[PDB]
DNA sequence: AAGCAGTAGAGCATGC
DNA sequence: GCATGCTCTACTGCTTCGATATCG
């Protein structure tokens, strides 16, 4: 901690002191080498916590120490006679940073919120800048086996931590250090993690702002993309957003070019060549200043050199010129070096490619650019001199003023152009109604308005503070002036409206897409606040016409084009229902078309956010559908939506029948909202009924052949799926089968319809007949093979949820499904999705599927034990997880180059056995040997892990994945039985080892390694542990003192949920 | 010059002195007329900023600064004058617009008071000052050069401005639209040959060879050699159209009158450019150096006086001697010219504002990689400074300016590569250099031959330099890159009709092609493709000569497991020999038999009985050499070419035999209509628009040839993607009626199934009868 | 030897 | 309390000239 209270040339002695201490206390064999691991931990929380007059050093003053500790160690132990101390102090830095980040629980302004960890932020952002400076150097072999775990923890932790502004920086750092060394030349494991995380971060960032957009974009573009070139169309608006978001915050305007140079050289030259017409014309705000700027002085004015070199060139200028090298000029980058780099990459881009920066030689727009904005010139300004008063015409200034205000890249002219344009718009607005008349005293100027209005928006939400503060009341005041009574439906409001609309339906604009919604909010408030409400009968600004415009927006096959009808509803849901009489006629005729747009969104994109907005669009309406016509469900004359039959009234009762009729759709996210709305639509009738009375009441009127036409849909009534297919035929059938599988699994999950009532031989459905064929294709172009593997593996979890639903509910009695699905095939698919999931099609990369898999495996394996059949399940699982398989897998060579298979095939068995234990039938599959009450598989595992460390040659080393295996393998062997006296007799051990000095007692190391599973196992059977612990307190007092300390502090630590266990431990000791 | 001071405060003092009464006046029009006196061409980048600043400073002496909107919904006068001044000081283009509007405002307000006795004198005074501006300026700044030429052409007295400096000013500041409109406005209100010669010199540089036809007639006194020499450079033929310029130059009779001096300099300058567009680096050097002096001119003070010569004879001198330096032998006679020229100031600014890339290439020749660094960073800053100043809506100026950045950064790449030391001991960066240079060509058909010559000669000089410095089989790897650069240069120089350049490029790329097998095939294919492309405009009996000269080499060895192994090399020889025989047989069958008069072995070569076999053998050999290609191409656009030449040649032979009557050629011809329909329907499937419009040829050849080949239509029409007939659907629902409605039936069924909305409206009229 | 001319070193004032 | 920044004064070495001892 006392490094910035020094002077230079003594700090070398300080760093040599700390290196000498760490070298001396490390070379005596591991009993004491585990305080290196906590001293760096302690110093890290010292200096990552710091936010005659002295000062308060923040965090910059130690980065020279932390480079000294491991970079030039060889030029630090030159005098001190050098094995791996740099290695160890890198591994402990990795471990300590993913342990400081392991317990922070971070669930200033960020985004209308501050509900994270009260003050852990300042101890966090210092850590993120500190690792930005210490991390990215020397990414050698020290970092190669650390990318998997460091990536995986941060994915899993930031997935619950969106708006944190800073959990993507460490991923950018590890991917930069992962393409520094090779490692990306498809080991095939982390690649799928990052490929799948690309789309999730792409859809998450679209609703965000400046610091967090910058964070995600510098993550995304730093993906390698010599190798992630597949779907190169997917992220080019994640590149042209960087340049357009350059020009005011340079460190991503750099990385746009630093990406765009490495894409182009190594991506093969046909999948890139269509993608230049849009990348490049953004790169021409970087050629607009010709060095006419003169701000601060461009000479050497007077300094410590400008006097010392005057009186001859003596030795004091040598003293001064050995003093200006160590300034470490590392302040981002200067703008003019970016302009030179723009020109150098534009030159190196090619010859054919190069001429893309302009129009394309007589397109539609080239011969429209030559034309005046409006023909007759208005805005005649008369500049008063003393005696002349001439006339200077405006409007020749406008296509350079409004082009210069947006993209200037020099703020001293940008603020000038902005102030000029605001006064010019004010003069234009005041000119428009003089007093003379209305054709030559008030001449129209909407050919200027139609190009002045799509630029006030792009100014008023641009980046900068000052222009935003200057254009908020203008863009909010002219809405108030336009939407009026005296206005009487002119032609400029229509231009403003279409400008707002194409502000929403526009690409590369996720800061304006919200501001036009705020304009729609102001439209709807002030358009009824002061209008004549008896006259809103014909104008096309009308909320009827706006809603019809929104519905035509709402049903449209252009992806971004329905997003307007999503977002305008999202921004005036707080309106239009706190005023009545206009909900009931069309907006619940719009609930169905909003769900129809959600049906349309079934094939678009993972990375757009259509789904996440349409769901809120239909959920904002289901909090006012349940407060209005509860008291007003009458037979009025109501307007009729899409698909519905004609009537004279549509009170509540045809919607629920349509909801029942289309529960079989292969639209994955409209079916869910359909069912979820139907269940809470079944009440609130006059009578206040229940879903059990209602569905049986309809079946007694219609019969079971009516409620199987809706569920089976079009899915009742194949060798092209021999190899894995990808056609839209096979995928649509798999989607139909999932629809039929999941449409009534919720009905038997509730108690609406009994399983014997609708699956007995009265419906003649092809359901179990089709599922039996479905279970016969399950294990048998690499582009869209994954497109079908995804739906092949989202069906088996619905099958298992279905049987887990049926076999535990009130339909007990399995006499309906004897050999249809409950045969020797579900007990094949369950076995292969329990153990070895990466051979039927389960990808290893995801998170929200591989965290749901052992849950449903255990929920079903508990649902076959109490069943009227268990023999098939036990005598199928008894063929893989036998004890002899554990014995033959427990080989003799688990150290060295057997890095993946021999120490990965064991871990699947370990996790499978853990989930069997969690079901409750570990012993039925694996009973012990004959005599003793200690399981002779657990004793075998315990002796194996105990003998695994003692050499017999130099040192059996460690890893992270040489300890997660050996700490799952050992947590298994305490779950079998009691097995505790063997544990304490292994701890209190006087056997002597040695290492190349001798200093080893074989119980200290085996305690020191794992040390937490051991104590948590000791704490369970507490009362029969302390007696034989304290009994040998004369001959081995050192070890029992250590074990008693190691149990006392761990019992102290979990005082927050087990307070009445430590009391028992105290009263027993 | 104390107004562009590199220190504020003091600059405010000097401006405060200059803006005072009795040093610069305080009447508005007299202040405007007085502002021209302080021009001083050291400053002109700032001159418009300073002119509008002094002209708008005395705005703040008036009683009119009280609410210039007069109502409640407003703003004050200074809120759009003070930021208007502050934005005019920051950018040139809005400054240009402000000064060019205020100037016209004052001069159109002065016409109330004062008679012509003084306003005519004021306008003649201003005319002399604008001439002085245009004569003295040396750094042609585009929003000033195009500012005075735009306040000129709006007034009636300034129009007679300066037709010989307007041309060379707006030509070198790349603002030719303004000067073209100025001179075409001067030609309105004996003939005026001077302004016509300079206006044609303006149009000659932006292409526009269409509008050099209404200029050079014989009714404005101009000669008859200039029209016939523009009509041979309109088509890119700069080897006769320059050959008759000097034949017009040194002639002695001229019996119509004298060839006036304006036309003499037009002949000189156009002969310079027509020597520039080739690669003759000796005649351009001599014609540019030695039209002022005699017996080894010194050049040293010679060009810098008599100031006509700088804007005309300096660029081609420095370019010709530099390009002759950039390969070959030394002749250190440019370096001393620059070294003696640089002691001045008005020569030290002119030689480094405008050139700097010739300077960098000059100092890299004597291993001064330190001065060259300064000069090339100066050139980059000058490109950026210029490109950001020529206007938005002026295309092709920016394309002609942006076509130089590749040569700039190839210099900058060589500078950063030679001085790093991660190189020059391993050739694993050299391989990356040779594999990134061969994929960075400029585009064919858009980028003219001066730019191709720039890039190729700079690259050959750089490769020779790194072979000099790479003393750590390396002398084959660079020559096998130089070949593939020059070959692409030839294939771009052929497509723009520049044949005299490409012909000597072949003649210089033939001494070492005979030492390999991958080289001779590409050689002979490029040669005999040029010989086909050249024969489109020769009339007759000489194209037979050239396509007979290219016979004895197309049938050489070539199959050293090469033509049998490779497929595209097998396809190209066949299609080119087929087009050769097609050229001969179409040549001597429209003009029958006179062409064997100048013939010794030519007659026997066409014989390889007098007027029947000599056509029949050529047509059947064309059919053989065309039929090899489709079967060698079946195993896009690699099968489409071989298909469509076969379809078009067989259709051509069918329509040639259609207008006559025969039996034997009909017996040969009875295989061709089978070959037409399938080979067109196999290329209509693939997305080809050069064959979709050939559908009524099928729909008529079926009717006229119906005894065979209709199942041959049905089997192919049964599988064609059925939206390639929505154009011809009213052309098929009339063949539905009459006979041979089969092979319409299936496709109409497919369209009525898939898209039952296209055919609904052309079906009612056809079912109506 | 005589003149001079240039730099080393010590003490006051400042900063972290 | 430790490192640096700045001036002035006395020490010290160089250059030129003239006298003295030495070696032929």
CA-to-CA dists, residue B432 to B428, B438, B468, angstroms: 7, 10, 18
CA distance A958 to A894: 11
Q: Which single residue is written with the structure tokens 């130059």?
A: B249
**Which residues in chain B are contacts of A354 at CB distance < 8 A?**
402, 405-406, 442
CA distance A967 to A617: 48
CA-to-CA dists, residue B707 to A456, B679, B704, angstroms: 73, 20, 9
A305-CA/C14-C1' distance, Å: 19
Within 10 angstroms of residue A456's Cβ, the number of other Cβ atoms is 19
Close Cβ partners of B572 (under 8 Å, ≥ 6 residues apart): B525
Closest CA to A19 of A85, A92, A84, A87: A85
A390 to B398: CB separation less than 8 angstroms, yes or no: no
CA-to-CA dists, residue A310 to A306, A317, A320, A846, B262, angstroms: 7, 10, 13, 70, 60
B108 to A417: CB separation less than 8 angstroms, yes or no: no
Bridge partners, B255 (sequence order)? B257
A386 to B83: CB separation less than 8 angstroms, yes or no: no
Nucleotide nearest to A5 (CA to C1'): C16
Query: Residue B737 — left, alpha, or beta (φ > 0 → left; ψ -120 to 50 → alpha)?
Result: alpha
Bridge partners, A392 (sequence order)? A381
B75 to A346: CB separation less than 8 angstroms, yes or no: no
B28 to A413: CB separation less than 8 angstroms, yes or no: no
CA distance B138 to B134: 9
CA distance A653 to A659: 10
Q: Is B146 exposed, middle or buried (0-12, 13-18, 19+ CB in 10 A)?
A: buried
Contact criterion met (CB below 8 Å) for B623 and B671 = no
CA-to-CA dists, residue B589 to A603, B519, B541, angstroms: 63, 36, 12
Closest CA to B75 of A729, A911, A445, A381: A381
Contacts within 8 Å (CB) and 24+ apart, A28-33: A28/A999, A29/A995, A29/A997, A29/A999, A29/A1000, A30/A1005, A30/A1008, A31/A999, A31/A1004, A31/A1005, A31/A1008
CA distance A239 to A534: 51
Q: Which residues touch strand D (CB under 7 A)?
A: A 7, 10, 52, 304, 316, 319
Asked if A52 CB < 7 A from strand C, the reply is yes
Closest CA to A879 of A915, A820, A828, A929: A828
A316-CA/C9-C1' distance, Å: 15
- Gap positions in chain B, given as the residue before each gap (C–N > 2.5 A)? 73, 189, 472, 608, 635
Q: How far is B678 from chain A (nearest CA, A)?
A: 31
**Which residues in chain A are contacts of B71 at CB distance < 8 A?**
430
CA-to-CA dists, residue B215 to A906, B159, B227, B243, B257, angstroms: 92, 21, 9, 22, 19
A359 to B80: CB separation less than 8 angstroms, yes or no: no
Q: Which of A287, A299, A348 sits opposite B409 (nearest CB)?
A: A348
Close Cβ partners of A142 (under 8 Å, ≥ 6 residues apart): A86, A87, A90, A91
Q: Which single residue is written with the structure tokens 């070139």?
A: A229
Number of A–B residue contacts, CB under 8 Å: 159
Close Cβ partners of A16 (under 8 Å, ≥ 6 residues apart): A76, A80
Q: Token pair for residue A687?
A: 């009578």
Close Cβ partners of A325 (under 8 Å, ≥ 6 residues apart): none
Can you count the helices (H) and strands (E) in chain B? 39, 0
Q: State this model's resolution in angstroms.
A: 3.7
Q: How far is B54 from chain A (nearest CA, A)?
A: 12
CA-to-CA dists, residue A620 to A151, A505, A591, A613, A651, angstroms: 37, 21, 10, 11, 20
Within 10 angstroms of residue A172's Cβ, the number of other Cβ atoms is 21
Residues 659-718 of A with CB under 7 A from strand C: none
CA distance A305 to B761: 90
Q: How far is B32 from chain A (nearest CA, A)?
A: 12
CA distance A179 to B617: 66
Contact criterion met (CB below 8 Å) for A285 and A413 = no
Bridge partners, B257 (sequence order)? B255
Bridge partners, A381 (sequence order)? A392
CA distance A500 to A541: 12
* DSSP reduced 3-state for A392: strand
Q: How far is A439 from chain B (nearest CA, A)?
A: 19
Alpha carbon distance, N-terminus to C-terminus of chain A: 40
Asked if A182 CB < 7 A from strand C, the reply is no
HSE value, Cβ hemisphere, 13 Å, CA-based, for B27: 5
Within 10 angstroms of residue A783's Cβ, the number of other Cβ atoms is 9
Contact criterion met (CB below 8 Å) for A940 and A932 = no
* DSSP reduced 3-state for B257: strand
* DSSP reduced 3-state for A993: strand
* Distance from chain centroid for Cα A979: 44
A312-CA/D12-C1' distance, Å: 22
A390 to B436: CB separation less than 8 angstroms, yes or no: no
Contact criterion met (CB below 8 Å) for A610 and A566 = yes
B80 to A427: CB separation less than 8 angstroms, yes or no: yes
CA-to-CA dists, residue A1041 to A56, A1014, B64, B78, angstroms: 43, 15, 97, 87
Report strand pairing: A380-381 vs A392-393: antiparallel
* Distance from chain centroid for Cα A974: 37
CA distance A953 to B436: 53
**Which residues in chain A are contacts of B385 at CB distance < 8 A?**
290-291
* Distance from chain centroid for Cα B559: 40
Q: Token pair for residue B679?
A: 């080979």
Nearest chain A Cα to B397, which residue?
A358
Alpha carbon distance, N-terminus to C-terminus of chain B: 90
Residues 311-330 of A with CB under 7 A from strand C: 312, 314-315
* DSSP reduced 3-state for B83: helix
At residue B255, what are phi and psi to the nearest 5 degrees?
A: -90, 70
CA distance B299 to B306: 12
Q: Which of A339, A416, A417 sits opposite B384 (nearest CB)?
A: A339
Query: Residue B34 — left, alpha, or beta (φ > 0 → left; ψ -120 to 50 → alpha)?
Result: alpha
Q: Identify from A351, A367, A417, A467 which residue to disrupt to test chain B contact, counting B C-beta atoms within 10 A and taking the largest count.
A: A351
CA distance B758 to B751: 8
- Gap positions in chain A, given as the residue before each gap (C–N > 2.5 A)? 51, 81, 107, 186, 717, 780, 952, 996
- DSSP conformation letters of A446-501: HHHHHHHHHHHHHHHTSS-HHHHHHHHHHHHHHHHHHSSSSS-S-SHHHHHHHHHH
Contact criterion met (CB below 8 Å) for A207 and A190 = no
A302-CA/C12-C1' distance, Å: 25
At residue A169, what are phi and psi to the nearest 5 degrees?
A: -65, -40
B19-CA/C9-C1' distance, Å: 59
- DSSP conformation letters of A329-391: --SS--HHHHHHHHHHHHHHT-STTTTTSS--SS-TTHHHHTS-SSSS---EE----SS----
Q: Which nucleotides of D are covered by protein (CB under 7 A)?
A: 1-3, 5-6
* DSSP reduced 3-state for B637: coil
A423 to B83: CB separation less than 8 angstroms, yes or no: yes
Within 10 angstroms of residue A273's Cβ, the number of other Cβ atoms is 14
B729-CA/D15-C1' distance, Å: 115
CA distance A824 to A879: 13
Q: Which single residue is written with the structure tokens 């693939």?
A: B686
CA distance A614 to A597: 8
At residue A892, what are phi and psi to the nearest 5 degrees?
A: -115, 0
Q: Token pair for residue B529?
A: 């493709």
**Which residues in chain A are contacts of B447 at CB distance < 8 A?**
351
A351 to B92: CB separation less than 8 angstroms, yes or no: no
């Amino acid at each position: 901690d006392s490094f910035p209270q020094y002077s230079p040339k003594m700090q070398l002695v300080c760093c040599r002191a700390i290196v000498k201490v760490f070298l001396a206390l490390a070379a005596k064999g591991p009993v004491l080498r585990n305080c290196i691991s906590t001293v760096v931990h302690q110093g890290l929380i010292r200096i990552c916590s710091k936010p005659g007059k002295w000062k308060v050093p923040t965090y910059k003053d130690y980065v020279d120490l932390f480079r000294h500790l491991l970079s030039s160690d060889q030029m630090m132990d030159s005098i001190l006679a050098s094995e791996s101390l740099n290695h160890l102090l890198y591994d402990e830095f990795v471990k300590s940073v993913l342990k400081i980040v392991e317990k922070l629980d971070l669930t200033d302004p960020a985004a209308n919120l501050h509900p994270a960890k009260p003050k852990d932020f300042s101890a966090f952002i210092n850590l993120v800048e500190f690792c930005r400076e210490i991390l990215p150097e020397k990414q050698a072999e020290f970092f190669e086996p650390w990318v998997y775990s460091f990536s995986y923890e941060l994915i899993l932790q930031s997935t619950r931590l969106p708006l944190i502004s800073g959990f993507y920086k460490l991923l950018s750092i590890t991917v930069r250090n992962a393409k520094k060394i090779k490692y990306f030349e498809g080991k095939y494991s982390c690649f799928a993690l990052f490929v799948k995380f690309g789309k999730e971060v792409a859809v998450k960032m679209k609703q965000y702002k400046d610091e967090l957009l910058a964070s995600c974009l510098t993550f995304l573009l730093s993906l390698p993309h010599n190798i992630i070139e597949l779907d190169v169309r997917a992220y080019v608006p994640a590149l042209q957003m960087a340049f357009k978001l350059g020009l005011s915050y340079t460190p991503l305007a750099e990385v746009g070019l630093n990406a765009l140079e490495e894409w182009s050289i190594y991506i093969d030259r046909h999948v890139m060549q269509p993608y230049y017409k849009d990348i490049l014309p953004c790169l021409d705000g970087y050629l607009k200043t010709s060095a006419l700027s003169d701000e601060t002085k461009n000479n050497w004015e007077v300094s410590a050199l400008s006097r010392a070199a005057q009186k001859g060139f003596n030795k004091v200028v040598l003293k001064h010129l050995k003093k200006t090298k160590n300034l470490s000029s590392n302040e981002a980058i200067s703008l003019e070096e970016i302009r030179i780099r723009v020109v150098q990459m534009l030159g190196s881009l090619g010859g054919q490619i190069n001429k893309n920066l302009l129009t394309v030689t007589s397109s539609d727009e080239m011969m429209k650019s030559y034309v005046a904005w409006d023909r007759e010139k208005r805005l005649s300004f008369a500049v008063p001199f003393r005696e002349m008063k001439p006339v200077i015409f405006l409007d020749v200034f406008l296509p350079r003023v409004t082009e210069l205000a947006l993209t200037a890249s020099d703020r001293q002219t940008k603020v000038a152009a902005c102030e000029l344009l605001h006064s010019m718009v004010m003069f234009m607005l005041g000119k428009a109604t003089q007093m003379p008349e209305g054709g030559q005293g008030a001449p129209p100027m909407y050919q200027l308005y139609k190009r002045t209005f799509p630029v006030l928006l792009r100014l008023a939400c641009d980046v900068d503070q000052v222009t935003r503060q200057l254009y908020e009341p203008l863009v909010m005041q002219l809405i108030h002036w336009f939407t009026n009574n005296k206005k009487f439906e002119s032609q400029d409001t229509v231009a403003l409206l279409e400008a707002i609309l194409d502000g929403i339906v526009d690409p590369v604009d996720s800061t304006l897409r919200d501001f036009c919604g705020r304009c729609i909010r102001e439209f709807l408030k002030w358009s009824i606040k002061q209008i004549t409400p008896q006259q809103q009968e014909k104008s096309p600004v009308n909320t009827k016409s706006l809603f019809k415009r929104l519905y035509s927006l709402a049903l449209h096959p252009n992806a971004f084009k329905r997003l307007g009808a999503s977002l305008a509803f999202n921004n005036i849901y707080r309106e239009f229902r706190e005023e009545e009489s206009l909900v009931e006629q069309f907006v619940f005729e719009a609930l169905v078309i909003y769900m129809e747009s959600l049906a349309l969104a079934h094939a678009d994109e993972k990375s757009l956010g259509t789904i996440q907005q349409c769901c809120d669009a239909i959920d904002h309406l289901c909090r006012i559908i349940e407060k209005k016509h509860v008291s007003l469900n009458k037979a009025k004359k109501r307007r009729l939506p899409r698909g519905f039959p004609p009537s004279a009234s549509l009170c509540l009762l045809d919607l629920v029948k349509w909801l029942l009729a289309h529960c079989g759709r292969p639209q994955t996210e409209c079916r869910h909202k359909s069912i979820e709305l139907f269940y809470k639509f079944v009440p609130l009738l006059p009578g206040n009924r229940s879903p059990n009375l209602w569905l049986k009441d309809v079946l007694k009127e219609e019969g079971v052949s009516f409620l199987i036409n809706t569920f089976e849909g079009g899915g009742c009534g194949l060798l092209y799926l021999r190899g894995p297919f990808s056609l839209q035929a096979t995928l649509c059938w798999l989607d139909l089968l999932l629809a039929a599988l999941e449409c009534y699994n919720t009905f038997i999950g509730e108690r609406t319809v009994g399983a014997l009532q609708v699956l007995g031989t009265e419906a003649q459905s092809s359901l179990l007949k089709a599922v039996a064929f479905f279970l016969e294709s399950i294990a048998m172009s690499p582009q869209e093979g994954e497109r079908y593997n995804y739906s092949k593996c989202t069906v088996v979890v619905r099958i298992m949820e279905f049987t887990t639903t049926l076999l535990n509910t009130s339909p007990e009695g399995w006499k309906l499904l004897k050999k249809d699905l409950c045969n020797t095939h579900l007990m094949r698919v369950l076995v292969q999705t329990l153990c070895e999931p990466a051979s039927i099609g389960f990808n290893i990369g995801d998170v929200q599927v591989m965290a749901h898999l052992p849950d449903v495996c255990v929920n079903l394996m508990k649902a076959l034990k109490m069943s009227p059949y268990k023999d098939i399940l036990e005598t199928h699982l008894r063929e893989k997880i036998t004890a002899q398989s554990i014995e033959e897998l427990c080989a003799v060579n688990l150290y060295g180059p057997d890095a993946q298979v021999d120490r990965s095939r064991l871990a699947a068995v370990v996790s499978a056995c853990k989930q069997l234990h969690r079901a409750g039938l570990l012993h039925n599959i694996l009973p012990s040997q004959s005599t003793d009450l200690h399981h002779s598989v657990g004793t075998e595992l315990l002796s194996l892990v105990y003998k695994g460390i003692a050499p017999g040659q130099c040192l059996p080393s460690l890893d992270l994945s040489c300890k997660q295996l050996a700490s799952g393998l050992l947590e298994l062997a305490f779950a079998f039985g009691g097995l505790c006296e063997r544990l304490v007799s292994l701890l209190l051990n006087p056997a002597v080892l040695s290492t190349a000095v001798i200093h080893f007692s074989h119980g200290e190391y085996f305690y020191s390694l794992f040390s937490e599973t051991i104590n948590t196992e000791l704490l369970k059977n507490l009362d029969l542990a302390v007696l034989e612990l304290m009994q040998s307190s004369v001959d081995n007092t050192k070890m029992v003192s250590a074990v008693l300390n190691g149990m006392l502090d761990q019992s102290f630590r979990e005082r927050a949920n087990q307070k009445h266990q430590g009391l028992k431990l105290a009263t027993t000791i | 010059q104390g107004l562009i001071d590199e220190n504020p405060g003091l600059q405010l003092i000097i401006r405060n002195f200059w803006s005072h009464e009795t040093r610069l006046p305080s009447n508005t029009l007299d202040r405007l007329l007085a502002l021209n006196s302080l021009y001083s061409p050291k400053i002109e980048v700032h001159f418009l900023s300073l002119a509008t600043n002094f002209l708008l400073e005395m705005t703040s002496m008036s009683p009119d600064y009280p609410n210039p909107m007069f109502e409640h919904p407003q703003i004050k006068h200074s809120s759009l004058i003070t930021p208007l001044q502050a934005v005019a000081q920051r950018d040139p283009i809005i400054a240009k617009q402000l000064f060019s509007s205020l100037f016209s405002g004052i001069l159109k307000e002065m016409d109330k008071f004062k008679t012509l006795s003084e306003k005519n004198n004021i306008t003649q005074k201003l005319l002399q000052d604008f001439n002085r501006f245009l004569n003295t300026t040396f750094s042609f700044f585009p929003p000033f050069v195009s500012c005075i030429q735009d306040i000129s052409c709006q007034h009636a007295a300034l129009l007679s401005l300066d037709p010989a400096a307007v041309s060379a000013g707006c030509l070198a500041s790349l603002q030719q639209p303004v000067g073209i409109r100025l001179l075409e406005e001067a030609l309105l209100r004996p003939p005026d040959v001077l302004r016509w010669v300079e206006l044609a010199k303006l149009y000659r540089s932006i292409g526009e060879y269409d509008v050099l036809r209404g200029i050079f007639t014989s009714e404005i006194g101009t000669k008859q050699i200039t029209q016939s020499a523009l009509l041979a450079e309109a088509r890119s033929d700069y080897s006769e159209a320059a050959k008759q310029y000097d034949e017009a130059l040194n002639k002695q009779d001229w019996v119509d009158g004298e060839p006036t001096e304006a036309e003499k300099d037009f002949w000189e300058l156009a002969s310079l450019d027509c020597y520039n567009h080739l690669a003759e680096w000796k005649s351009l050097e001599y014609c540019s150096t030695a039209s002022i002096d005699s017996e080894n001119p010194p050049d040293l003070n010679k060009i810098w006086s008599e100031p006509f010569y700088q804007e005309t004879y300096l660029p081609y001198m420095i370019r010709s001697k530099l390009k002759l330096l950039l390969q070959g032998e030394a002749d250190q006679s440019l370096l001393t010219f620059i070294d003696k020229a640089m002691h001045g100031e008005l020569q030290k600014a002119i030689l480094e504002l405008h050139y700097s890339q010739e300077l960098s290439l000059l100092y890299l020749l004597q291993d001064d990689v330190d001065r060259a660094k300064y000069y090339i960073q100066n050139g980059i800053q000058s490109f950026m400074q210029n490109y950001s100043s020529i206007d938005v809506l002026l295309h092709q100026s920016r394309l002609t300016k942006l076509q130089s950045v590749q040569a700039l950064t190839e210099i900058q790449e060589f500078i950063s590569f030679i001085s790093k030391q991660g190189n020059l001991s391993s050739q694993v960066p050299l391989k990356r250099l040779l594999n990134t240079w061969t994929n960075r060509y400029p585009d064919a058909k858009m980028d003219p031959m001066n730019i191709w010559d720039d890039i190729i000669t700079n690259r050959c000089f750089f490769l020779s330099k790194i072979e000099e410095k790479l003393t750590p089989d390396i002398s084959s790897l660079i020559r096998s890159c130089k070949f593939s650069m020059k070959m692409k240069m030839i294939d771009s120089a052929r497509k723009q009709n520049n044949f005299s350049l490409a012909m000597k490029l072949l003649k210089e790329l033939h001494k070492e092609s005979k030492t390999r097998d991958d080289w001779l095939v590409s050689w002979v294919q490029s040669y005999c493709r040029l010989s086909h492309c050249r024969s489109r405009s020769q009339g007759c009996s000489e194209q037979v000569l050239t396509v007979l000269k290219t016979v004895s080499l197309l049938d050489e060895n070539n199959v050293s497991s090469y033509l049998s192994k490779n497929i595209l090399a097998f396809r190209d020889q066949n299609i080119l020999l087929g087009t050769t025989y097609r050229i001969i047989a179409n040549a001597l069958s429209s003009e029958p038999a006179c062409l064997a008069e100048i013939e010794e072995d030519k007659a026997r070569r066409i014989l390889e009985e007098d007027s029947e076999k000599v056509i029949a053998g050529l047509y059947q050999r064309a059919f053989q050499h065309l039929s090899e290609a489709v079967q060698a191409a079946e195993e896009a656009a690699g099968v489409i070419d071989a298909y469509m030449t076969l379809a078009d040649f067989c259709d051509q032979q069918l329509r040639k035999e259609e207008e006559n009557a025969s039996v034997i050629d009909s017996a040969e011809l009875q295989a061709y209509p089978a070959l037409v329909v399938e080979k067109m329907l196999k290329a209509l499937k693939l997305n080809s628009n050069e064959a979709r419009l050939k559908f009524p040829r099928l729909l008529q050849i079926i009717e006229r040839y119906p005894e065979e080949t209709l199942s041959l239509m049905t089997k192919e029409i049964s599988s064609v993607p059925c939206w390639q007939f929505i154009s011809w659907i009213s052309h098929m629902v009339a063949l539905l009626d009459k006979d041979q409605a089969v092979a319409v039936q299936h496709s109409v069924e497919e369209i009525t199934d898939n898209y039952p909305q296209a055919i609904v409206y052309p079906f009612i009229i056809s079912s109506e009868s």
